[PDB]
Design a protein around this nucleic acid. Structure first.
Lengths: 87, 62, 190, 108, 204, 72, 137, 174
RNA sequence: AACGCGACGAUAACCCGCACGUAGACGUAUAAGAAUAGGCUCCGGCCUCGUAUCCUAGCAGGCGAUUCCUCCGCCGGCCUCGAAGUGGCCGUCGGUAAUUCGCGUAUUGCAAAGACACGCGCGGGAUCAAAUCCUUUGCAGACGACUUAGAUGUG
């Protein structure tokens, strides 16, 4: 297999970590980045494709999609981080 | 073929990020930030304005 | 051999103002500002006449004396650029596909951008960015010739060298395909 | 209030035993006195009483402080280190510990 | 002149790597507490590609079965590069050696409890007092950045804020020296000149 | 070339004592060979020109050869 | 054509420059031997400032601001002595900041135990006024 | 070699009933003490002539001192040194105040610059250039030149080697 | 990193009985930055040099004066310190040889077990706030381990 994913290790926590958030600059306005949801299943769609140069241009294409059920979040805290020479 | 970390491919990608996908992500992010705004707007040691103390492995113990 | 003393001379004209803090030499003249740092070489800077800079090495080897000759002409080139200026006249020639050149001065960072199209029919635009301090204009006196002007000789020569390298023919015989942009005239403004 | 000290000794450190490469002799001990840099400055400190004070974790005489006494015998090297002899050789764990050099017996 | 201090803090700027390490290791084994500050501003002699060659040869040495145990842990920080040099001059396998390494502290930049203290210098390892003027030298900070250190911009921003606070402190220090000289000249008119005549003869 | 970025395996500079034994054996054997070759068997450069008082040395050795023929 | 430079103005070593040796003595340069060694002669009447004629190395010497104006090269002990008395370099050495520092540090070591106590007492008396003036300022 | 001296060594073959009153040779020898000056005398003499230590005797050994060890003289040394190829001549020049200081600087120069040892260097002639404009080397002529005066850039301070730490950074302008 | 680190949430105050009080303190005093073929500054001048600068007298540092507004410490009040977090100013109170005195110090003999007060812990019980086992769960499982759920509910 791939050495980038070895050894085969169980995830330390059931949730999942973002690890890397996108790099921030102050020129854009304020916006949040991540969100949760809960997976519900998968279903099929048909999409009128709008891809120039593909064989499936302007014709129906069946596509497998996933459905993630996302109830609204609630903001409860605000943590702030300071930039140290240890991270 | 040319590698995915090739310098020419990186420069071609950098021109796409600046000229083609640049303003499209800027316009979408403007609409999302306007939506978060609508949801949001819907003595110093006694007032807390002046920051004080709350409530050592860097220096040797004297 | 450990030569005890070696000295050199940089004359300075009447319309100049040169200043050396430690080794940071700045030359102020009619054409503008020039400045460079020479802390990498041990030179003793002095004034010995009305308009003469002195540059001396004490207890030096051959390479220490030879380092005074290269820093003599670098400072003198700064004197020439701030008095007379430097001009590079590049000329672009083509066989079939007419190469198109457009120069626009960018509002931020104040750098001229020279953009090149239709180099042997290639669809890629070639955008080369000039150094801060050099000005590029399409010449109206002669056909298909670019003029780069500025005070820093290193800046105008590097900007000219960057244009020649970016329009280089690849995987094709250079005896048959003579398309490109080449430096033709190399001198001063005045 | 006096706000003064009570130091009548010169500070020193215990460096090592007398040794070659692979042979150490713990009967003699090398002392670096604070301020001496030469053999000429070390010559003033020859035949001076030397004390190594430490703590016990048990009171034996009403106090937890035990002392080992010795004397500076001869200089060592060119850098001002002296070598000293004690009644009992100093431990090994005290390599780098404080050592007090007294000003007696005196010929000033 | 062979002084004994509680904790001596050394500014690493302009200091040769191994010549500071051999002085520090001799001091640590003698019983002296050492704090080394600005390890990114240390200097290595020779040219930069030689130091870049030497670390990549060090980066070539690893254990076969698993590098988590028994493998040479390659440290990309300037402080741990200096710590590796000091540790090689210390019998760290022994208990005396490990106690000497506990007396050492190394930092990249000048942390807040140590920018208020007086940073001493070692003349036997200073680059301007030891290296020939024509010879080339490199900096450990740019060696570490081009081999994996990711906190160079953090340290440079933190050093910039320390200079601004240091610059304002020097203005106050400059003013206190003004007021001391003004007070000394003024108090000298009423200072009982039999006292000042005796102090001048005594050296003071 | 790329030795700065990817250095190769270094050549060890510590001599094994079995290699040092071969070198001393091989060198002393060559010393025997030149002494055996010399046993088998089958120009002064003059005063340097740059010497300042070279002319006086030729005149002094001329007068020395005057004294040699006078004695003999 | 205005020029303003700021480089290091080292003290030129030359015929007539008087240098301080490590023993506190003084000697003027008579002839330059190499770029490291030189021939020197200080014929002072003060025995603490005297130096016999001989080779001094520049590593063990230290350059003073005083220079004799027209010392000839290779001048013997008679000519250097007459130039020392005419220029009065014993007088201008005493006025130098280096000799004032050397005089003060010689008064350091001459301080006896009683004398060091009077030093502590009089500095306490001096600083009582200086503290009072500083609070006024 | 160390505090070299210059000795006058007078030697002769042992007198014989057939050959009374022998030739009485003389050589000038630069040696650290007397016992090597006598040894170097018999080394050279057995190379030139037939006379050896067993068949000869030393008549006198007298040291020779400089006329004026307080004046600065330019010295020219002609020497013949043996390398792995053969024997070569050199004319070197040095600026000292004595003849033993001439050969002291010579042995340090030949060892440093050509890796020559004492048993390979033959001191042919040591002369004092009595008048200038007979100096022919560029480094010594550089020192002889008119109104010579140089500064001393980057003089490191003499800080004591047992003063491990210092508070103020040193300056290099003295 | 299971012998690296941080932010945060909720904790363990009682009562009864008993076991003991330094990998090297002795003034453990001292923040500019930067250059080193230059720099600092009262803008007079100064720089080899930390051989410097503060503090340092008093039964291991007493008691009372004459006399002094200097230095130190604690609390506040207002502000400042975040790289592994502290100082400034003001106000109260306590102490305080910068000058000059008076009454003690001894025969521990030339250097080498009393009372009171305060902490760190042990062995019981009672008062908290949790975790584990338990029962269910199947997003998990070789076995441990993991995701849930069980105190009134939208169970």
């Amino acid at each position: 297999g791939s050495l980038a994913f070895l050894p085969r290790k169980r995830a330390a926590r059931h949730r999942g970590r973002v690890k890397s958030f996108p790099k921030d600059d102050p020129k854009k306005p304020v916006h949040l980045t991540a969100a949760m949801g809960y997976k519900a299943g998968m279903t099929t769609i048909v999409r009128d494709l709008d891809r120039p140069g593909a064989k499936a241009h302007k014709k129906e294409v069946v596509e497998a999609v996933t459905i993630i059920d996302c109830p609204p979040m609630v903001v409860v805290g605000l943590v702030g981080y300071i930039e140290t020479p240890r991270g | 073929a040319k590698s995915a970390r090739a310098s020419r491919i990186k420069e071609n990608h950098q021109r796409f990020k600046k000229n083609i996908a640049g303003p499209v992500e800027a316009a979408r992010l403007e609409r999302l930030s306007a939506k978060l705004m609508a949801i949001a707007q819907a003595s110093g040691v006694k007032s807390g304005k002046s920051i004080g103390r709350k409530d050592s492995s860097i220096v040797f113990p004297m | 051999m450990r030569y005890i003393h070696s000295e050199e001379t940089i004359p300075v004209p009447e319309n100049l103002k040169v200043s050396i803090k430690s080794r940071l030499v700045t030359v102020e003249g009619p054409r503008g500002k020039l400045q460079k740092d020479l802390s990498h070489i041990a030179v003793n800077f002095s004034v010995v006449k009305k308009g003469v800079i002195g540059l001396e090495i004490h207890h030096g080897s051959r390479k220490d004396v030879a380092a005074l000759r290269t820093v003599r002409t670098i400072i003198n080139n700064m004197i020439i650029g701030v008095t007379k200026g430097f001009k590079y006249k590049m000329r672009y020639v083509y066989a079939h596909f007419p190469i198109n050149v457009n120069v626009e001065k960018n509002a931020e960072t104040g750098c001229y951008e020279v953009e090149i199209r239709n180099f042997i029919g290639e669809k890629i635009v070639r955008k080369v960015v000039m150094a801060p301090g050099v000005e590029v204009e399409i010449s109206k006196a002669q056909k298909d010739e670019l003029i780069l002007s500025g005070n820093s000789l290193e800046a105008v020569s590097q900007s000219a060298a960057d244009i020649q390298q970016i329009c280089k023919v690849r995987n094709k015989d250079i005896r048959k395909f003579l398309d490109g942009i080449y430096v033709s005239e190399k001198g001063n403004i005045v | 209030p006096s706000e003064a000290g009570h130091r009548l000794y010169v500070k020193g450190r215990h460096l090592s035993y007398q040794r070659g490469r692979r042979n150490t002799h713990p009967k003699t001990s090398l002392i670096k006195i604070e301020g001496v840099d030469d053999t000429a400055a070390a010559n003033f400190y020859l035949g001076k009483r030397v004390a190594y004070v430490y703590r016990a974790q048990k009171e034996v005489r009403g106090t937890k402080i035990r002392v080992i006494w010795g004397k500076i015998t001869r200089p060592h090297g060119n850098s001002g280190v002296v070598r000293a002899k004690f009644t009992h050789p100093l431990p090994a764990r005290s390599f780098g510990a404080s050592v007090r050099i007294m000003l007696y017996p005196s010929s000033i | 002149m062979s002084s004994f201090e509680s904790v001596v803090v050394i500014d690493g700027k302009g200091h040769l790597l191994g010549r500071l390490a051999s002085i520090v290791a001799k001091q640590l084994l003698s019983g002296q507490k050492i704090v080394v500050v600005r390890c990114e501003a240390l200097n290595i002699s020779g040219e930069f590609f030689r130091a870049k060659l030497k670390y990549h040869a060090y980066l070539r040495k690893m254990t076969r079965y698993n590098p988590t145990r028994g493998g040479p842990f390659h440290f990309r920080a300037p402080s741990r590069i200096f710590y590796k040099a000091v540790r090689g001059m210390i019998p760290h396998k022994t208990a005396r050696g490990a106690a000497a390494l506990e007396r050492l502290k190394v930092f990249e930049g000048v942390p807040p409890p140590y920018d208020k203290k007086k940073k001493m210098v070692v003349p036997q390892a200073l680059r301007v007092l030891r290296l020939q003027p024509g010879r080339k030298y490199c900096t450990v900070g740019r060696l570490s950045h081009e081999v994996g250190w990711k906190y160079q911009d953090v340290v440079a921003r933190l050093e910039e804020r320390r200079k601004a606070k240091g610059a304002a402190y020097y203005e106050r220090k400059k003013l206190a020296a003004r007021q001391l000289s003004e007070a000394k000249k003024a108090a000298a008119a009423k200072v009982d000149p039999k006292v000042s005549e005796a102090l001048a003869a005594y050296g003071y | 070339a790329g030795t700065i970025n990817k250095p190769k395996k270094p050549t060890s500079k510590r001599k094994t004592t079995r290699l040092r034994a071969k070198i001393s054996k091989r060198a002393a054997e060559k010393k025997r060979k030149e002494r055996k070759l010399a046993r088998k068997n089958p120009k002064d450069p003059g005063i340097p020109n740059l010497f300042p008082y070279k002319e006086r040395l030729l005149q002094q050795r001329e007068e020395e050869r005057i004294r040699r023929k006078e004695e003999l | 054509a205005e020029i303003n430079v700021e480089a290091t103005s080292w003290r030129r070593v030359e015929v007539g420059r008087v240098l301080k040796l490590e023993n506190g003595s003084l000697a003027a340069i008579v002839e330059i031997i190499d770029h490291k060694r030189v021939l020197a002669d200080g014929p002072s009447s003060d025995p603490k400032l005297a130096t016999p004629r001989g080779i001094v190395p520049l590593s063990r010497a230290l350059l003073t601001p005083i220079v004799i104006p027209k010392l000839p090269r290779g001048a013997r002990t008679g000519a250097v002595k007459k130039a020392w008395e005419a220029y009065g370099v014993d007088a201008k050495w005493k006025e130098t900041n280096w000799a004032k520092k050397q005089l003060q540090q010689e008064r350091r070591q001459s301080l006896t135990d009683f004398d060091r106590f009077k030093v502590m007492r009089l500095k306490k008396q001096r600083r009582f006024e200086e503290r009072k003036a500083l609070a006024k300022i | 070699m160390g505090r070299l001296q210059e000795y006058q060594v007078i030697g002769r073959h042992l007198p014989t009933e057939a050959n009374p009153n022998p030739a009485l040779y003389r050589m000038r020898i630069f040696a650290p003490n007397e016992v090597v000056a006598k040894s170097r005398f018999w080394y050279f003499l057995r190379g030139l002539k037939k006379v050896k230590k067993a068949t000869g005797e030393i008549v006198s050994v007298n040291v020779i001192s400089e006329k004026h060890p307080l004046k600065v003289k330019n010295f020219g040394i002609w020497l013949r040194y043996d390398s792995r190829s053969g024997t070569h001549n050199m004319y070197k020049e040095y600026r000292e105040t004595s003849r033993v200081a001439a050969v002291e600087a010579m042995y340090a120069d030949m060892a440093a610059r050509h890796r020559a040892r004492f048993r390979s260097i033959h001191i042919l002639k040591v002369v004092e250039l009595e008048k200038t404009e007979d100096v022919k080397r560029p480094y010594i002529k550089q020192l002889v030149a008119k109104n010579l005066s140089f500064p001393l850039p980057h003089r490191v301070p003499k800080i004591s080697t047992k003063k491990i730490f210092s508070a103020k950074r040193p300056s290099t302008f003295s």
